[PDB]
Amino acid sequence: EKILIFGHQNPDTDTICSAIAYADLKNKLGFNAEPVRLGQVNGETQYALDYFKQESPRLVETAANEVNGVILVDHNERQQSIKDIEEVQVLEVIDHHRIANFETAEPLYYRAEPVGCTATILNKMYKENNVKIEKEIAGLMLSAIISDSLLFKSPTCTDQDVAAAKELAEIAGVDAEEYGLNMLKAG
Amino acid sequence: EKILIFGHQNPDTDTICSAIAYADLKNKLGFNAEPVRLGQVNGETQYALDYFKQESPRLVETAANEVNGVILVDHNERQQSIKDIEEVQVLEVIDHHRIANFETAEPLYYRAEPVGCTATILNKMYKENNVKIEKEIAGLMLSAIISDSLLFKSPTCTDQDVAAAKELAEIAGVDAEEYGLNMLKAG
Ligand SMILES: [Mn+2]
Ligand SMILES: [Mn+2]
Ligand SMILES: [Mn+2]
Ligand SMILES: [Mn+2]
């Protein structure tokens, strides 16, 4: 019944913030999720956490000693994932990358979209579930999109990512450019 | 640009009907999609096509001679797919099975949900896009759910499937159980 949600090894802002955000969505719907991380938080992500007054996810090396099932955000390939990923069931994946080095024994909820950031997809999922995005969660989701898009300069950034960042900046109460440049400079 | 939408080799009713239904949705949304099939239509599927006045999708052996990109419904595993799947880009997958024998070079729209039929997922996609399901298309979608669920008897059947079947039967103008028994008998 408890599940862990995490992104990839060598975490980036999307991998930390999308784990926290998806755990919030799961918990606001009555489930039992803890967001965790697989490595050290970098200076860009730490700026986001500090700014929006959010705790760092707990660091884990393995999952099977804790839970039976996990959710992956921002990755799918086994070599990017937790070291004992073969010993737990992947219940869901929310991601924006190519699929490789990944198989399941059972059906699952797999949601990949060809957008520039996982948090763009989570924005969609909050709205599909009629769950309000709290100011600080919006700030973390905005941070993820700024990070993965290089402040909207990456060709991986789509109109969906820009539209999500506009929504989330309004919710978070920040100017995306001013906040984004400070966040990126902290990294 | 033209795309082909298809389900698996040895087609079943979900693989035919979900290809037709998702091509309808795509086309309503301004794309250029043709549903195709990879083998012969069985008698159960033929009943559904005849009842709802739909033509059997065109049979193909290969896709790369026609298009650059394809959408898979009701499958992902390469050995279930078209023989030259590695020569085209997989743009999207809509499915309800485990993931295996499947990789992509690029990102894509991958939507798997742990439900009993692809058409239950497509029903959500119509509603997400505010596109009306025409009577005949609802009939094919209902046929897919009855087929995959064995008239709601299969261990894979969920409450999401049962609910979608009732909705689609109302739109199609049939009684799900009465129509479904005749369709199943035809196979
Ligand atoms: Mn990442
Ligand atoms: Mn990312
Ligand atoms: Mn099938
Ligand atoms: Mn199916």
- Tell me the CA–centroid distance for residue A170 and ligand 2, in Å: 21
Residue of A nearest to B103 (CA): A100
Domain holding B27, by residue range, is 1-187
Residue position matching structure tokens 């400070």: A182
A14 is in an annotated binding site: yes
Calculate how close chain A gets to B173, using CA atoms only, in Å.
Answer: 29
CB atoms within 10 A of CB B32: 11
Distant-in-sequence, close-in-space partners of B30: CB < 8 Å, separation ≥ 6: none
Report the CATH number at residue A122.
Answer: 3.90.1640.10
Q: Nearest ligand, CA of residue A96?
A: 2
Cross-chain residue pair B114–A108, CB shorter than 8 Å: yes
- Determine the distance from the C-alpha atom of residue A175 to the mean position of all C-alpha atoms in its chain, rounded to a whole number: 21
A66: its two tokens: 């804790």
> How close is the nearest chain B Cα to the Cα of A38, in Å?
23
Enumerate residues 6+ apart whose C-beta is below 8 A from B154: B116, B148
Give how far Cα B46 sits from Cα of A166, B6, B16, B179, B185, Å. Answer: 49, 17, 10, 14, 12
For B108, the closest chain A residue by CA position comes to: A114
Nearest ligand for residue A149 CA: 2
Residues whose CB is less than 8 angstroms from the CB of residue B37 and which lie 6 or more positions away in sequence, other chains included: B6, B7, B11, B15, B16, B19, B56, B57, B58, B59, B60
Asked if residues A97 and A112 have their Cβ atoms less than 8 Å apart, the reply is yes
Sheet holding A3-6, edge to edge: A58-59, A33-37, A3-6, A69-73, A89-95, A109-112, B109-112, B89-95, B69-73, B2-6, B32-37, B58-59
| A53 CB within 8 Å of a chain B CB | no
Cα–Cα separations (whole angstroms), residue B63 to A16, A47, B17: 40, 49, 19
Which residues of chain A make contact with B128, given a CB cutoff of 8 A? 128
CA–CA distances in Å: residue A13 to residues A17, A94, A172: 6, 15, 16
Q: Distance from the CA of A153 to the center of ligand 2, in angstroms?
A: 15
Q: How many domains does chain A have?
A: 1
Q: Residue B108: its chain A contacts at CB < 8 A?
A: 98-99, 112, 114
A155 close to B (CB below 8 A): no
Question: Residue B68 phi/psi, 5° resolution?
Answer: -100, -20
Half-sphere exposure of A97 (CA within 13 A, CB side): 17
Cα A12-A16-A71 angle, rounded to 5 deg: 115
The DSSP output letter for A52 is T
Identify whether the C-beta of residue A38 lies closer than 8 Å to the C-beta of residue A6: yes
